[PDB]
Write a protein that binds this ligand. Structure first.
Ligand SMILES: [K+]
Ligand SMILES: [K+]
Ligand SMILES: [K+]
Ligand SMILES: [K+]
Ligand SMILES: [Mn+2]
Ligand SMILES: [Mn+2]
Ligand SMILES: [Mn+2]
Ligand SMILES: [Mn+2]
Lengths: 512, 517, 517, 491
């Protein structure tokens, strides 16, 4: 059998594991959406085309680097690459665009390299004149209060926490420190101050500018950096302004406080990013996996998208093949229950961006087939409280029906994505094919595992009921074309009693 | 809270038990249908009316007693009592009629100048069992006549003969030319025409005698809804019932009564071929050791639950009530446990056929079943059923389970289903929703037969079809709601799950909708 | 296979039910202890001997009736019957003796000219209930007198009044200047001095009257083992029993009978303070609606199972047998379901106290309990208990669960425990092993009280201590094995789990060993 | 609370996940043993001392490289480093030594292979040590070179270019490699292992039961004691796994080769399947290769590496390995310290509730008194949050049977057999203590002194504190195979 079905029929998790079969070919669209960071390696229209073809679903713009003009070019190229496939509506793949916020970063000064000798004296300055006078015994940083916040005996991580510094006297013109971990240091590198309370705002003048930019260029999603408390996302919301309620806000969890106040942060956000990079510097590297698995679990419970991020395939920045740990990282993110998996170096600057995307694609398909739905579904139902919202009620119904007949797909009409979401919330195995007129909602829905958006272009029919049927039919055809559904398959169709959003309430079983 | 909801939310069966609350009032129509046997105590139109009011859903005609004329009067009186409530379609309660077959019984003769007189079989004495036609009526303390010619040829020396609900006990010591010389092993007081059981003897009597066949044809002609088939031992037995029922009667549901060891052993083959099962505890309780019935009962109920077929629990559920206005503590727990076991219907016999409290007896099964229905640990039950039931490609099943699931998620007060033959109402109840299954149908018969399936409340719909089919569909669903409101099944603010189909005719159910009342 | 093993190996409760097998013979001592009530039917030494042979483990003396002298004779006769088997220590069966308290009973008066004669209260007729001192003797078909002046003040117009076991039903339709003008709801033949109940109406008689205290002091002096304490409504009720029991009687296990609504509601507090519980169905079934008892029964048994305390199921489990040599189908299933519920003991009252078949009645509870015990789905049962029971630091508990676990893994025939006060035997049964708990003790009393715990089979050990303690330990273990072999609990080639301790005196169990027989 | 106890008390796996707490400090010896490969970075006695201190439990000698003399020096150095702590029997840490077999490898001879260009096999000329290559790769066959980084399609054509070094691993999937599992050299290497008293054989390229039979034959009679760990490195091996496991003492998920022989996407499936099956069989299973590669070069692991380790433990692995990280890299001790740190966190996060349930449930009934005592002991341990289960064991088997059920309390195994003490590291949760005193006259006393020994060693290393409960497992008579007693004692 295929799809790891013998494994799906197991009575225990152990028996399940014991039955995973390397010769059981996956046989389903991959449900985990891939987010790819745009950079020099992935910015040319022709490259983007390849990346789309290979599996990219979300383009991530990292506003930690590049000017407004630079990101506008990125948006313009993505949109071009994406619309090059509009020749065939039945095959067209929407691509989301996520603005990633700079946030309260700290960076060293200005392709040369100094060497911080272990045990040696290094001075950290925020004096404007030393802004480029950086050397083996002097590092300049762009956070003037550094001197006010890192006390004697405090730690200062530099460059992915690879360099490490102990403050051994805080004198007038800077921090007198001793290198604890040396390393070959380069230009403008990221700095971390664990244990220190960085009074740096979650939203600086630039972030606000950057957000307004996102509104004007119609970005779909904000990955909000360094989110430490509910008011942080409120601030993002305010900045996003009224022209931008539609925009999904994904809070990146990058530090201890963020981890601790996670519950409050989730309730107020549209989803979460396990921001492992910073997280892995702010808390001990041994402990990330706990935060990751805790947050993914909690999101699964709340029904919100969760993203797993950073170094999932690092070696690929430089090599055509991933390390054995990277492969298992991707699979375990999926098995953890992550809605999306990300790429950074691997697609922004590396020598194999398309190969990197093909790999997340390949692994996610295997891992998705290896999900023990039986336990998963049971636990979700069991944990999720009762509900009175007809849309939820239909969803779980639909998912249940899908399971009973091994439906190829659940086809949903949706206006804002919400009813597609409520379906994927319960993790059907059948694919959730979402038919929508809202180009934006079609993009934002990539954030939810197992949704395949289809953008519908025809003008409304006179008779609403007809309009509904043409759309469902549209789903089926697109379905047939991309090999999601074959003649003789059963499909579950979810619709509503009247137009407008918020009235989903019907579930139907149809045969193809 | 009500409906034993704290108990419903328990994480284990033990925790569930630990949270059952005597002050949590049930709050739902009772889902276990009650079958009542018709006799002198329950035959008058006015009595029937009371029994309907009290909860009766199936009238059982016991063809072991009475003539054709006698049962025709019963049917006529039921139907009258039933139709007396047709003045209000929104409140009308359909009542099924079940013909219960005589089958291969054996009874003693009539007593010497005494149909209502008693002889006494003393422990340790010689009793001759005769088949001699001349002794039918001549029977005494040392002589009992029996209506089974072959008895003399089937009980060996050392073989046991039970008389009267197994309370009398004879052991064959000598066989002879003019009967069985027996010694009374258990004595007691004996009357006329009492049931005989022959465990250990293979009884070569047919499952369907010339009379049964006549009885069955009778059932066809008078439009009975259900056949409780006695002494069903193997698949061919129900085939025989089917043939006899003839072509004028495919619609009739066949319920095999399981009354003996062989029947218990070939149960699987019998179920596959029957519409449902009756755990016939009376005979079963004599054919196998009394200690073992509970095992057959729980096994069969379990298996039916699995197959999704109606199962009936029967006999002595409330015996003391034949004679007393209150049940014994075992009787009460018997009913509750039949329900908790997972029985679709519970029966009454003596209690409604001859006893002094037939209505009180019906009211009691009503009261207990409501409590017990609320105490079912659906969480486990539902999980196990899904888990056990094979995948399915039939859109009707698919919608059913969907509907049940949706119902659970919002504590739906009801699932309302349009159904033509009952099948989609049945597939719902197969998954044991807690929300009541309100089945709307134009088939008066299907409305009656549906009582066989736990949790289905049938509503007979009387209006002529609208021109636009979609409108006809809506009026029906609306009809369900209103009836619902009126009988306190649904209150304003409830959510309800509506199940319908894409086109007319049966077999095409495939839609599930969430509506608020 | 035997012992319903296929059914034990099932992955779900449903599959379990589906695999119960009527041909799978039980093969194990029955673990549910049987309490028999002593009366005219069961007071003769020779009868008692039969009842012991048949399975009785606890004699229950019902102090609601009979004088001190009368109960002394009962004790004497039991002890005589019991010690008649002392000729063989390997086979000797200890029998507990439980004193059942009268408590705050409410009663009717003596009849017009008839300490034996009878009045009929006809359904629908006017009935005056006086509290008038004069009429305590002047009762007829329209006048019943009652020994509780306050009844007039507590039952409001429209309230019920149940009489004699709840078989007679009166409704107050007028409160008058000397009596409640009642209509007869339920009719029937009324006797002299019968029990009256007042549901919903709150009562104010003490839990412990001057007589109870006397009765308790009596129990001490005659060395009763167990007090079944009637009408326990709150923790202080058992404190009172404890005080009355006096210092000569800490050893005595106190079982609170739960007989009313308040008792049901304050159950948690009552359990914490008692050694065990009695589900007193009789009264309970009159105080709260008859439909609801099964809920109180299953909730209490569940909670006791959780707490690890003995729970008894009681009253009417086999009533028809008071009068008939076979039980009704409901009675059989009642017993099975008590066991499946998880009851430690099952009781008999009328069936053994007055009826015509006391020994047969005891043989039946024995026969059913064995079947039902084999049908427990231990897999779930064990899982749930572990899961629910909090961590523990007491080495005795820790050894128990370990022992139970080891037993399961090798289908041990038995767990053999040395115990001084019964406590380590109890902690084993607490986890419901399937293997039998063979408890070896020198305390004749502890040997009796242990019957209160499902699955414990006490063996009284008589030899004087050896010089070397270790040797004394081994002879006792060996004693268990031999007794074991002799009664067919263990066969050559069986594995057995032996639980002992590091030093003498109670409270130090901490060793578990696997041995082969 | 500590040890992720709130998460242990969860009613579902989801709820469990939801309750993992980064501020819940682990508080227990780490139970996953660490296998470290010896090389230039890790061969000096002083280095070895550091690596023992940091957590190493098994030294891995990779016979794919180095001469006999070279491996003798390694053994010698390990043994020295190890015995330098013998100053104190209560603290002494035994270190196993595992001989890792070369087996049917293929390597290149002693340059950048351009994408597109011609390359013959016997810059435009790679040499290979497997003469039959010409015989088993047909027109349109694939030849991987160096950790599957290069790809050659058959005369070949380069499909994937790359920078080629000296003597590098060649892989041929789809081809049936008729090279023997045991060459003349392997046999020599194995005989070597016997003579120098290695403890464990990691047997390379195990494809079928007869492969381990061959290893067994070569190991000879002087070496029945030696535990044999079959390395699963290819498709056939994955397919015939059941047969292989039944006949082996344990398994190594040899990800490196496996990741080249089967698609990289699929390894995690083989890994989780094998670890699951081993957990079921009660045999040790090893997770291997690249668990921390970046550390070969960098002082900190990547985020994928960290999660790789934790997931191996959560998968249920008995041991985790390091190769380049400790054999040649610039951070061997840091690498060992990391596997130590992660394994402790991951171990505390195991959802025993489910795990234990499932193992009981799955494991068939048993009549062997040792098993019966084990499960009993584990059950007792759970009920009182025992700090430890202390077992007397002669061959390790009763320690093994305990760990088979994954207690959370640590399994402190007391033994006289120095070797058994070493091999027991293969079983999660076993902490061996070597006992040196001569037997007492009264056997019962000898038993007690040993149990007492375990307690004291326990106290000293902070496994058990006064007031803890401990579970003690012993037997009714001397000699192995008769464990049958379980006792609850307070410290
Ligand atoms: K950023
Ligand atoms: K009949
Ligand atoms: K009493
Ligand atoms: K090797
Ligand atoms: Mn970051
Ligand atoms: Mn019958
Ligand atoms: Mn009472
Ligand atoms: Mn390898």
């Amino acid at each position: 059998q295929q799809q790891q079905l013998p494994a799906a029929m197991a009575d225990t998790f152990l028996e399940h594991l014991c039955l995973l079969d390397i010769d059981s070919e996956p046989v389903a669209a991959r449900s985990t959406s891939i987010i790819a960071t745009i950079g020099p390696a992935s910015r040319s229209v022709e490259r983007l085309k390849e990346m789309i073809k290979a599996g990219m679903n979300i383009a991530r713009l990292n506003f930690s680097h590049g000017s407004h003009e630079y990101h506008a070019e990125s948006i313009a190229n993505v949109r071009e690459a994406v619309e090059s496939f509009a020749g065939s509506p039945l095959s067209y793949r929407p691509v989301a665009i996520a603005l990633d916020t700079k946030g309260p970063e700290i960076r060293t000064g200005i392709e040369s390299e100094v060497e911080l000798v272990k045990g040696s004296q290094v001075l950290v300055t925020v004096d404007p004149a030393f802004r480029t006078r950086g050397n083996a015994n002097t590092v300049w940083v762009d956070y003037p209060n550094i001197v006010r916040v890192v006390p004697v005996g405090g730690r200062i991580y530099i460059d992915d926490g690879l360099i490490s510094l102990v403050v051994q006297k805080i004198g007038p013109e800077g921090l007198v420190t001793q290198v604890e971990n040396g390393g070959v240091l380069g230009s403008r590198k990221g700095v971390n101050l664990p244990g220190a309370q960085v009074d740096l705002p979650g939203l600086s003048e630039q972030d606000v500018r950057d957000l307004r930019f996102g509104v004007e260029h119609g970005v779909d999603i904000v990955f909000a950096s360094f989110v430490r408390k509910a008011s942080d996302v409120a601030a993002v919301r305010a900045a996003l302004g009224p022209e931008g309620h539609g925009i999904k806000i994904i809070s990146k969890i990058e530090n201890h406080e963020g981890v601790k106040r996670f519950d409050e942060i989730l309730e107020v956000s549209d989803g979460i990013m396990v921001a492992r990079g910073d997280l892995g510097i702010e808390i001990p590297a041994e402990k990330v996996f706990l935060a990751q698995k805790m947050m993914i679990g909690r999101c699964n419970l709340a029904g919100k998208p969760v993203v797993c991020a950073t170094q999932m395939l690092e070696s690929m920045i430089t090599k055509p093949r991933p390390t054995r740990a990277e492969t298992s990282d991707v699979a375990n993110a999926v098995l953890d229950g992550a809605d999306c998996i990300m790429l950074s170096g691997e697609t922004a600057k590396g020598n194999f961006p398309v190969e990197a995307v093909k790999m997340q694609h390949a692994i996610a398909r295997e891992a998705e087939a290896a999900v023990y739905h039986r336990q998963l579904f049971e636990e979700l139902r069991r944990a999720a409280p009762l509900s009175r919202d007809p849309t939820e009620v239909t969803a779980i119904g639909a998912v249940e029906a899908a399971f009973k007949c091994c439906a190829a797909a659940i086809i949903v009409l949706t206006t804002t994505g919400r009813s597609a979401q409520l379906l994927s919330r319960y993790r059907p195995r059948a694919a959730v094919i979402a038919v929508t007129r809202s180009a934006q909602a079609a993009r934002q829905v990539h954030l939810c595992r197992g949704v395949f958006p289809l953008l519908y272009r025809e003008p409304p029919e006179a008779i609403w009921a007809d309009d509904v049927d043409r759309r469902v039919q549209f789903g089926i055809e697109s379905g047939k074309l991309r090999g999601f559904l074959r003649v003789g398959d059963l499909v579950i169709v979810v619709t509503g009693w009247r137009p407008g959003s918020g009235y989903t309430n019907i579930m139907r079983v149809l045969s193809i």
